[PDB]
Amino acid sequence: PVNPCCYYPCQHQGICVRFGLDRYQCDCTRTGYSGPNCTIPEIWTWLRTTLRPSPSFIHFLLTHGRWLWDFVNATFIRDTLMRLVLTVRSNLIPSPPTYNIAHDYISWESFSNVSYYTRILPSVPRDCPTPMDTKGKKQLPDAEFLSRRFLLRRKFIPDPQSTNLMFAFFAQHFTHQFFKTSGKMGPGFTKALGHGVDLGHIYGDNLERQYQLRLFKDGKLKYQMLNGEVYPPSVEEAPVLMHYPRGIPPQSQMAVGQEVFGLLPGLMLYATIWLREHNRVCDLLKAEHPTWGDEQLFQTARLILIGETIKIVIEEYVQQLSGYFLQLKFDPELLFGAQFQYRNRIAMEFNQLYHWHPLMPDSFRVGPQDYSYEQFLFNTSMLVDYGVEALVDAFSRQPAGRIGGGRNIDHHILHVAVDVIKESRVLRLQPFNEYRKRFGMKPYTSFQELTGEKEMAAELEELYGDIDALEFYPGLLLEKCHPNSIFGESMIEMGAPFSLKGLLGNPICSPEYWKASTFGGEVGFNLVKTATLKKLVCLNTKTCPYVSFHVPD
Amino acid sequence: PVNPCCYYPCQHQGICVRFGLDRYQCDCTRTGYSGPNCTIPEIWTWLRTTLRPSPSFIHFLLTHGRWLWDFVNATFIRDTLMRLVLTVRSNLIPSPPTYNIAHDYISWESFSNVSYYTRILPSVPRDCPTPMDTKGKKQLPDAEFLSRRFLLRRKFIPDPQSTNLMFAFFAQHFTHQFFKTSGKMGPGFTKALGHGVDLGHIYGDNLERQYQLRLFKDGKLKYQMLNGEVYPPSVEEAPVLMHYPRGIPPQSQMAVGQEVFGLLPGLMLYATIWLREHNRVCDLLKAEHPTWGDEQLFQTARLILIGETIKIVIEEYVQQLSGYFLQLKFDPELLFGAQFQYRNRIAMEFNQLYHWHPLMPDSFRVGPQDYSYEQFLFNTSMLVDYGVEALVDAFSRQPAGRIGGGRNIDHHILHVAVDVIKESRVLRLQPFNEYRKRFGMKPYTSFQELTGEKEMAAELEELYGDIDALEFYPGLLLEKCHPNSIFGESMIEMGAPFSLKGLLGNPICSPEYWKASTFGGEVGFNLVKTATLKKLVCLNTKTCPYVSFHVPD
Ligand code: HEM
Ligand code: HEM
Ligand SMILES: C=CCc1cccc(-c2nc(-c3ccccc3Cl)c(-c3ccccc3Cl)[nH]2)c1OC(=O)COC
Ligand SMILES: C=CCc1cccc(-c2nc(-c3ccccc3Cl)c(-c3ccccc3Cl)[nH]2)c1OC(=O)COC
Ligand SMILES: *[C@@H]1O[C@H](CO)[C@@H](O[C@@H]2O[C@H](CO)[C@@H](O)[C@H](O)[C@H]2NC(C)=O)[C@H](O)[C@H]1NC(C)=O
Ligand SMILES: *[C@@H]1O[C@H](CO)[C@@H](O[C@@H]2O[C@H](CO)[C@@H](O)[C@H](O)[C@H]2NC(C)=O)[C@H](O)[C@H]1NC(C)=O
Ligand SMILES: *[C@@H]1O[C@H](CO)[C@@H](O[C@@H]2O[C@H](CO)[C@@H](O)[C@H](O)[C@H]2NC(C)=O)[C@H](O)[C@H]1NC(C)=O
Ligand SMILES: *[C@@H]1O[C@H](CO)[C@@H](O[C@@H]2O[C@H](CO)[C@@H](O)[C@H](O)[C@H]2NC(C)=O)[C@H](O)[C@H]1NC(C)=O
Ligand SMILES: *[C@@H]1O[C@H](CO)[C@@H](O[C@@H]2O[C@H](CO)[C@@H](O)[C@H](O)[C@H]2NC(C)=O)[C@H](O)[C@H]1NC(C)=O
Ligand SMILES: *[C@@H]1O[C@H](CO)[C@@H](O[C@@H]2O[C@H](CO)[C@@H](O)[C@H](O)[C@H]2NC(C)=O)[C@H](O)[C@H]1NC(C)=O
């Protein structure tokens, strides 16, 4: 007999539980609905679902009518809206987390073992006809064909929100502290056990690595001086595992918390910036805390950098990403009243969702010169030759590509997208519309509705056979984008829960941690509270270049 | 200069932060007080502290006036009070946890690294005159002398609350899943990374161990049949590390989740009981879930046993320990409204606090026979000869010793108390009265007030020199006990925060987990909801012996 839980029968977060040979029952417990399939709303849930605005309508409000929003930003209405949206966007994420790749059920091993990526929706049961559901073809479309036809960039499409490469490298840099898939244990496992904003891309993902990187004097990190400017230490001075081209002299390498940051200068640029910041923070502490030691200095400086990392992400990174006129504000006290679980677990859906390779351009413009990918990647000497200032300026001045819409991934990095479609199929993710339903949206009824256009939609229908059999990763990048937006509706509504939960779920936002003593006096607490991207870049350089997440007008 | 933070200047959970060469400042942030030392109450906090009853007065209410309490139990006043107790006894424990042995400050390493025992109060700073504070002698009293004089049992003093050995072995069994100090890494570190009710004393503390113990058929654990009764497998069948006397035949050893349970029959008795229950739970699940596998069966049976473990501890274990007329009830939904962090971290203070070796008697009476310690401990064949039923009956009928008051630890196990006083000094715990202040009690003003008697108080004053220099572990056991109670005021107010946080901090109590699907249908959910000690013992035996936490009248 067929497995009933492959029809995805239960809506609104109902849990499909098999009884007997061919039956099922669903736990609509605390789902807000009732019935065999949890399709009968309770009195309040119906009240909510009727008085709701549509997600496209709310993007309209938040991206139009500035006069109203400038008034709302300067009044308390922001804080209430901050709480409103802040307290709402996190309820879609199970906490404590539920599932992982091996377990499609709540289990103690899925909770204790932090090496698993957690999961929002259970996997497609293995005993079912189509690889996605009861629906669709019996074979999935070729991954490399899908990419070469729909995700491959043909002409550079820039981000209409002015996003620059300075932003994209931060996204790569910032998100490679919790997205570190271990090739040895296979997809679905993670090396980054911090499972959040731990700055494990700076201080490494284990004690052994940070000890080799720490200078053990005044809490600082080891470093080297090239051209009179501070740079991270060479692998010779700091003997840590690094992924570098063979035969590269081990005095031109550099040691950082993330093994991979040597492969792009933009990532090492950020690692350089954070190290200078850390050592600068350590200098301020020792000035006001003469009696402290190396561990005391280091750990407090870490928390400071963690704090001002989250600050910059909320109020400048997400602020740019959303296009919202509602001023986003980092204030942990907004969640002190609500029941909030201060702990995160990276979900494999967040990993798939966050692959923003379309941000990368056709080639990299650094002032007068134009470096190709072969001429840019792996360049061990590019950062030192140009200096932090010139590279930060060059990236901030160069546009970055749009994420959504499709056909905007450069051919050099397209082999990632194919391996991601392959990975999505091996992890056995549920189809796209099922993730829409789980994230408070109605399923798309046809590919024409998805893409909002006729040619590429009709072909997709020929490959997949049915909209309900669409995959997760292809659907996100091919969805019609919001008007003059960087990516479409689904990427907003699905990534926003994970990102919020991962930034405000950090323990420093908790009531027990978010106090001035946690940061060794008010100096640290105000460094976190008043942090900006411009400050982080210009306080650690001899000059102040143009730094922002958007190109100048 | 002297370290100012050794005067313990800041009260009411104020954090001492050193500035400069010889200054300090305190973060009274969210402490409810104000001032340099957080001694100036706010309007509400003063309102609370004046309308407070004394802890001895509330014990009077909860242990007298049965007519009132029987009425309160059958009405909603129980549930409202349950919330009250839940929201009061849990706020004193930092979550996320703050300190550990190496770090006397909030740090990212103390949060991530689960091998550390966490901590409530920072260690006594190393640069200060006396080992406890600015106060007291320059040398602490000899630990072995303190034990032989004040903690050594002279005549068996029984528990006036009727506590039996059946209770005490459960306390040892239940609490050896989170109290597993690693001898290799030294005091202050833990092998039990679950840090709570993970039943790691049944399923081992790592995947390698549980796989060797699991039978991998219908989710069951391996086992062996002796005399027609189920017993845990011999080390030969299940090859896991065990601590056993040398040369003992391996087909007479037994393999369990906790390496140490072979050294006492009472501990192995409980492990036997839990295993039979686990395999019985696995039988019920397979009956209703034919399509499930070994991993699916096993993990759900684990959660069921975890649930009914917590149920038995709250409604029967603590019920016995407290003597409260208010019937305590296990209901996670009582905390759904409050902001409750569903995560625990074992505190080294809880480890010191729960060393209840006074419960152990002079000799163990098993029906007609009376086994000495040498004749009882390490007895590889005692459990199988007498059978589970006869031992459960024998222990429930035999009284257990009182914990508090002092001079009630048997000489066989007194070397533990000595090593605990040594361990407390190595971990560098703050003096007793400082823990009273941190746990919402006024400090004792003299040793005569502590013990409520004159002889042993005067000697303690001679050894210690000052009440404010009293150690943590001695103070708990020597404190005057509540009238006709097993232990005194301090053990109540200090243990209840850790115990409550560790049982209801288990994720299964969270809203995300506490549903019927988490236990594979209503059968699992009702096994958890209706669990009792009598059921756990008699459902897994051919006969039902006398099982209880109290001797018969
Ligand atoms: C030239 C630019 C880039 C290059 C060369 C590059 C390269 C790679 C490679 C080789 C992988 C491994 C995928 C696999 O082996 O299947 C990867 C994964 C990933 N990429 Fe990129 N990438 C670039 C830009 C970006 C950007 C701008 C983002 C923005 C978010 C991003 C996000 C990610 C993430 C989150 C992963 C997951 C890593 C993991 O799961 O361990 N990448 N990238
Ligand atoms: C015959 C009865 C008992 C024996 C033989 C025994 C034996 C031991 C031993 C040898 C230690 C190690 C201490 C050290 O090495 O410094 C220990 C620790 C401990 N004992 Fe017992 N004990 C008994 C009864 C109890 C009881 C009734 C309790 C009730 C709570 C208890 C609670 C503990 C705890 C919590 C630890 C801490 C273990 C750790 O920190 O790793 N013990 N016991
Ligand atoms: C106080 C602030 C609350 C708060 C804290 C921390 C993070 C967020 C956050 N927002 C968003 C977001 C929201 C709406 C529209 C667009 C975006 Cl990109 C995202 C996100 C979504 C998808 C992919 C990636 C990301 Cl990073 N993550 C966050 O929410 C916001 O600040 C904006 O929404 C109110
Ligand atoms: C829904 C119930 C919440 C709840 C769950 C789980 C455990 C507890 C708990 N209580 C106590 C306790 C509390 C007051 C007086 C006496 C005791 Cl022995 C203890 C404890 C204290 C000291 C040493 C050891 C222990 Cl085990 N542990 C608990 O708290 C209570 O039920 C009673 O609190 C007034
Ligand atoms: C809940 O959803 C399930 C699956 O979508 C529905 O079950 C199907 O019902 C149709 C209508 O008779 C049958 O033709 C299918 O054979 C059923 N499939 C399965 C697996 O049972 C069910 O009807 C829905 N519940 C309600 C009340 O409508
Ligand atoms: C977390 O889980 C993974 C996989 O479940 C564990 O790694 C596996 O352990 C088993 C048995 O020890 C081995 O047979 C596998 O070869 C290991 N690797 C993989 C990819 O499965 C890992 O040990 C667990 N981590 C912890 C702390 O328990
Ligand atoms: C790494 O980048 C450096 C620039 O710092 C490249 O060297 C430049 O190469 C361009 C032509 O590609 C010349 O116009 C510049 O004069 C060179 N500058 C220096 C200092 O050499 C270098 O070619 C890049 N490495 C790789 C492998 O492409
Ligand atoms: C906070 O507590 C500290 C320590 O008890 C107080 O410092 C003492 O103050 C008394 C009276 O001023 C002096 O006699 C002692 O010499 C001080 N001891 C030290 C180490 O400085 C301090 O006064 C308290 N703060 C307030 C406002 O009362
Ligand atoms: C947790 O912390 C402990 C102690 O800091 C770490 O164990 C020590 O690691 C250092 C460096 O690797 C060694 O020099 C010590 O000998 C180790 N043992 C002790 C008792 O210090 C441990 O590695 C950390 N665990 C994690 C997951 O980070
Ligand atoms: C382990 O306990 C067993 C009881 O099951 C002990 O054997 C008994 O010993 C007593 C005297 O101590 C005799 O009266 C009984 O006849 C014995 N019964 C059996 C079946 O042998 C045994 O001595 C204990 N082991 C140790 C090391 O003390």
Coordinates of C-alpha atoms in Angstrom, one line a residue, chain B residues 247-429:
Chain B
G247 CA 38.7 -11.3 37.3
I248 CA 34.9 -11.3 37.6
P249 CA 33.4 -13.6 34.9
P250 CA 32.1 -11.5 32.0
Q251 CA 28.9 -13.5 31.6
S252 CA 28.1 -12.5 35.2
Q253 CA 28.8 -8.8 34.6
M254 CA 26.0 -6.5 33.2
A255 CA 26.1 -3.7 30.6
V256 CA 24.2 -0.5 31.4
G257 CA 24.3 3.2 30.3
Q258 CA 26.2 4.3 33.5
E259 CA 29.7 2.7 33.9
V260 CA 29.4 2.7 37.7
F261 CA 26.0 0.9 38.3
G262 CA 27.7 -2.5 38.8
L263 CA 29.1 -1.4 42.2
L264 CA 25.7 -1.4 44.0
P265 CA 22.8 -3.8 43.5
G266 CA 20.3 -1.0 44.2
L267 CA 21.6 1.0 41.3
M268 CA 21.6 -2.0 39.0
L269 CA 18.1 -2.8 40.3
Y270 CA 16.8 0.5 38.9
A271 CA 18.7 0.0 35.6
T272 CA 17.1 -3.4 35.4
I273 CA 13.7 -1.8 36.0
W274 CA 14.1 0.9 33.4
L275 CA 15.3 -1.6 30.8
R276 CA 12.3 -3.8 31.2
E277 CA 10.1 -0.7 31.0
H278 CA 11.9 0.4 27.8
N279 CA 11.4 -2.9 26.1
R280 CA 7.8 -3.0 27.2
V281 CA 7.2 0.5 25.8
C282 CA 8.8 -0.8 22.5
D283 CA 6.3 -3.6 22.5
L284 CA 3.3 -1.2 22.8
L285 CA 4.6 1.0 20.0
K286 CA 5.2 -1.8 17.5
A287 CA 1.6 -2.9 18.3
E288 CA 0.2 0.5 17.1
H289 CA 3.1 1.4 14.7
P290 CA 3.8 -1.7 12.5
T291 CA 5.5 0.4 9.8
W292 CA 8.1 1.9 12.2
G293 CA 11.8 1.0 12.3
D294 CA 14.4 0.4 15.0
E295 CA 15.6 4.0 15.3
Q296 CA 12.0 5.3 15.2
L297 CA 10.9 2.8 17.8
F298 CA 13.9 3.4 20.1
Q299 CA 13.9 7.2 20.2
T300 CA 10.1 7.4 20.9
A301 CA 10.4 4.9 23.7
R302 CA 13.3 7.0 25.1
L303 CA 11.2 10.2 25.2
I304 CA 8.3 8.2 26.9
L305 CA 10.7 7.0 29.6
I306 CA 12.1 10.5 30.0
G307 CA 8.6 11.9 30.3
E308 CA 7.5 9.3 32.9
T309 CA 10.8 9.8 34.7
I310 CA 10.1 13.5 35.2
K311 CA 6.5 12.6 36.2
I312 CA 7.6 10.3 38.9
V313 CA 10.2 12.7 40.2
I314 CA 7.8 15.6 40.5
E315 CA 4.7 13.9 41.9
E316 CA 6.3 11.2 44.0
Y317 CA 10.0 11.9 44.6
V318 CA 9.8 15.6 45.4
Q319 CA 6.4 15.0 47.0
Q320 CA 8.1 12.7 49.5
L321 CA 11.1 15.0 50.0
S322 CA 9.1 18.2 50.7
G323 CA 6.5 16.9 53.1
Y324 CA 4.2 19.4 51.4
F325 CA 0.4 19.0 51.8
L326 CA 0.0 20.8 48.4
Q327 CA 0.0 17.9 46.0
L328 CA 2.7 18.7 43.4
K329 CA 1.6 18.0 39.8
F330 CA 3.7 17.5 36.6
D331 CA 2.2 19.7 33.9
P332 CA 4.5 21.5 31.5
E333 CA 1.5 23.6 30.3
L334 CA 1.7 25.6 33.5
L335 CA 4.8 27.3 32.1
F336 CA 3.5 27.9 28.6
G337 CA 2.5 31.4 29.5
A338 CA 5.7 32.5 31.2
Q339 CA 9.1 33.2 29.5
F340 CA 10.8 29.9 30.3
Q341 CA 14.1 28.8 28.8
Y342 CA 13.8 25.1 28.0
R343 CA 17.5 24.3 28.5
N344 CA 19.5 23.4 31.6
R345 CA 23.2 23.4 32.5
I346 CA 24.3 21.5 35.6
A347 CA 25.9 23.8 38.2
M348 CA 28.8 22.6 40.3
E349 CA 26.8 24.0 43.3
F350 CA 24.0 21.5 42.6
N351 CA 26.7 18.7 42.5
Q352 CA 27.9 19.7 46.0
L353 CA 24.4 20.3 47.3
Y354 CA 22.9 16.9 46.4
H355 CA 25.5 14.6 48.0
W356 CA 23.0 12.8 50.3
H357 CA 25.2 10.0 51.6
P358 CA 23.6 10.4 55.0
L359 CA 20.6 8.6 53.5
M360 CA 22.7 5.4 53.5
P361 CA 22.2 3.1 56.6
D362 CA 24.6 1.3 58.9
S363 CA 23.7 -2.0 57.2
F364 CA 21.2 -3.3 54.6
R365 CA 18.4 -5.4 55.8
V366 CA 17.0 -7.7 53.1
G367 CA 14.3 -9.8 54.8
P368 CA 15.9 -12.3 57.2
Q369 CA 19.5 -11.3 56.4
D370 CA 21.5 -8.2 57.2
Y371 CA 24.3 -7.5 54.8
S372 CA 27.3 -5.3 55.8
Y373 CA 28.8 -2.8 53.4
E374 CA 31.7 -5.2 52.4
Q375 CA 29.0 -7.9 52.0
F376 CA 26.7 -5.6 50.0
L377 CA 28.8 -3.5 47.8
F378 CA 30.3 -5.0 44.6
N379 CA 28.0 -8.0 44.9
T380 CA 27.8 -9.2 41.3
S381 CA 25.3 -12.0 42.1
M382 CA 23.0 -10.4 44.8
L383 CA 20.4 -8.9 42.4
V384 CA 19.8 -12.2 40.4
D385 CA 19.7 -14.4 43.5
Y386 CA 17.1 -12.3 45.3
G387 CA 15.2 -11.1 42.3
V388 CA 13.9 -7.6 41.4
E389 CA 10.7 -8.0 43.4
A390 CA 12.3 -9.1 46.7
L391 CA 14.9 -6.2 46.7
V392 CA 12.3 -3.6 45.9
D393 CA 10.3 -4.9 48.8
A394 CA 13.3 -5.0 51.1
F395 CA 14.4 -1.5 50.4
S396 CA 11.0 0.1 50.6
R397 CA 10.5 -1.5 54.1
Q398 CA 13.9 -0.3 55.5
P399 CA 14.3 3.3 56.8
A400 CA 16.8 5.6 55.4
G401 CA 18.9 8.1 57.4
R402 CA 18.3 11.8 57.8
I403 CA 20.4 14.2 55.6
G404 CA 20.7 17.4 57.6
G405 CA 21.6 18.1 61.2
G406 CA 25.0 16.6 60.9
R407 CA 26.8 13.6 62.4
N408 CA 24.8 11.2 60.2
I409 CA 27.2 10.0 57.5
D410 CA 28.3 6.4 57.9
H411 CA 32.0 5.8 58.4
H412 CA 32.3 3.6 55.3
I413 CA 31.2 6.4 53.0
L414 CA 32.7 9.3 54.9
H415 CA 35.7 9.5 52.6
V416 CA 33.3 10.9 50.1
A417 CA 32.4 13.8 52.3
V418 CA 36.1 14.6 52.9
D419 CA 36.8 14.6 49.1
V420 CA 33.8 16.8 48.7
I421 CA 35.2 19.4 51.2
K422 CA 38.5 19.1 49.3
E423 CA 36.7 19.5 46.0
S424 CA 34.7 22.5 47.2
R425 CA 38.0 24.2 48.2
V426 CA 39.6 23.4 44.8
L427 CA 36.6 24.7 42.8
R428 CA 36.9 27.8 45.1
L429 CA 33.3 28.1 46.2

